[PDB]
Symmetry: none
């Protein structure tokens, strides 16, 4: 992640090591480049991450904070997630029927922005362990002023990018507001992503698709599909031996930086400790349609594994049988 | 060495007897165990060899081959050794001044990886007797990708091991790439060693320190110090009668296996014939510091003999006098 950058006007270090959580694996830096740099386009075209420092993608939102947002976003309701710890356990509600024993670890809740702002205060007053994360799409369903800021994003840049990479439609666009210390555990998404930081700092640790064997994702039919089964804060090396070979790409993004997270790449995101609240807006695009050229890329093998798991759960008429069948196929035959 | 192991997926025998060279002495198997097995720690603590089959020590390098390496290791220069035969005659350049008559039998040469890859091809095209061996330390002086693979080694395992055995610092870390048929003649090293096989198969024949009398190492001041004077392919029983009593410990290591070669143990290493190129990475640690408890271990007597030879060469002001003086001390007095 490197030596903390110095803020303009001698305001000092943007952050210091004591704000970063400690992990068991090594990491090297993600390149930090200007969007006009030919190396930045090269990295994106080859689907490798890059932090673009001067896109002006969310320029108007740089002034956003809780006051400004509460006072201009509207009286609509927002999805707020809460967790007993720093780690947010998200899950797919639609898959809970496949695992009756799964007990949810995170709760969503609809509330008004000021209610969110107020619940935030208390947790700071008492200092409880509870944490929250607000997540909402940028529609026209929000305040007029927020809509103007939104219209002011650099759509020229991102649209051009979307066009040259061959990506599909902008599938999702989320505003995220979190508390210092918040951590979104490692997982991968099937879409291309531009992560635009707005307020505060977030440490992003990415792992290429070829580390599948070291990250142990949950069964595709499980509510936590696409998330790593390993507890980064207490890795169980007996159940997940290859987590000892994992190597990541790291960076700390701040106001104005845009991080490109290529599709299928794992990412672990954390809001720096004692760094104040964080605000980010993500942009997701469907990747480009498959051209079959060999040798296959790692993410294409991951896609094949996901498909085999899905087909099996349908053919057997019950996802709980997938594992027993796979083991039967392999033992004494391929292992 | 036992019955050749069968590779997963019915790919057949990993190797067959016809690939092993024939020798005049008998050998028994080195234990092949899991690193979680209590017997494996017992063997290492008592300084006996063991092949650990599941450490994941060099997991990321299992994908390495010439293409991958040439294309990612860099444009630096590598030490390549060549030999007219299958046996590589290594020597200590600094001791050549003690034996003016010593004429080197192996040559080193600095070249770029693709140059190494190309010279390799020719020797296969023409089928010459010439052979090569590439040897290089794993620094940061190598390509970025190779550095990531390297960072992905299971440092947690080896460091823990280094800690519990009381060993000193990791003194050396070498990458070795050789040709089928290559043989490194018997010799001992003064450091602890973990030999991690990556590609291809190597037959390793070890001899405990107490076989000193049957292996006849060269005089300590000679360029071939620590190497056996006996030609394993044509033992001279008149000059080395006790080579008829030698008994070894043997094993064939393959991708994923890690062989512990305790300090002072002799080892003879050969790349299976018609087995393709071999790749290995070795790790060397200084042994633990001497605690003097009796009865002395064999390697401690070897250390004493080496010291007497060294002191004598200094006291007499010339290493060539060591032998005449030792004979004078012994004849009609201790023999
Ligand atoms: Fe994500
Ligand atoms: Fe050696």
């Amino acid at each position: 992640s490197g030596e903390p950058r110095e803020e303009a006007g001698a305001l000092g270090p943007a952050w210091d090591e004591s704000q970063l959580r400690s992990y068991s694996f090594p990491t090297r830096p993600i390149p930090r480049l200007s969007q006009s740099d030919p190396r930045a386009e090269e990295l994106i075209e080859n689907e490798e991450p890059v932090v673009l420092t001067d896109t002006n993608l969310v320029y108007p939102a740089l002034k956003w904070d809780l006051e400004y947002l509460q006072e201009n976003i509207g009286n609509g309701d927002f999805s707020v997630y809460s967790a007993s710890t720093h780690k947010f356990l998200y899950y797919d509600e639609k898959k809970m029927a496949n695992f009756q024993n799964f007990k949810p670890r995170s709760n969503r809740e609809e509330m008004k922005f000021h209610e969110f702002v107020e619940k935030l205060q208390d947790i700071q007053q008492r200092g409880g362990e509870e944490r929250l994360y607000l997540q909402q799409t940028l529609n026209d369903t929000v305040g007029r002023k927020i809509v103007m800021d939104f219209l002011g994003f650099n759509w020229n840049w991102i649209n051009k990018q979307q066009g040259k990479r061959g990506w599909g439609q902008l599938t999702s666009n989320l505003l995220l507001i979190g508390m210092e210390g918040n951590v979104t555990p490692a997982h991968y998404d099937e879409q291309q992503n531009f992560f635009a930081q707005i307020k505060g700092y977030k440490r992003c640790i990415l792992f290429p698709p070829d580390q599948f064997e070291c990250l142990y994702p949950y069964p595709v039919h499980h509510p936590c599909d696409r998330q790593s089964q390993v507890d980064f804060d207490n890795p169980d090396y007996e159940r997940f031996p290859n987590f000892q070979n994992v190597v990541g790409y790291e960076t700390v993004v701040g106001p104005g930086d845009v991080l490109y997270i290529p599709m299928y790449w794992w990412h672990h995101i954390e809001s720096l400790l004692n760094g104040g609240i964080t605000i980010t807006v993500n942009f997701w695009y469907k990747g480009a349609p498959t051209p079959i050229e060999y040798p296959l890329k790692a993410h294409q093998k991951v896609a094949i594994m996901r498909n085999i798991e899905k087909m099996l759960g349908e053919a057997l008429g019950n996802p709980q049988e997938v594992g027993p069948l796979l083991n039967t196929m392999i033992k004494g035959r391929y292992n």
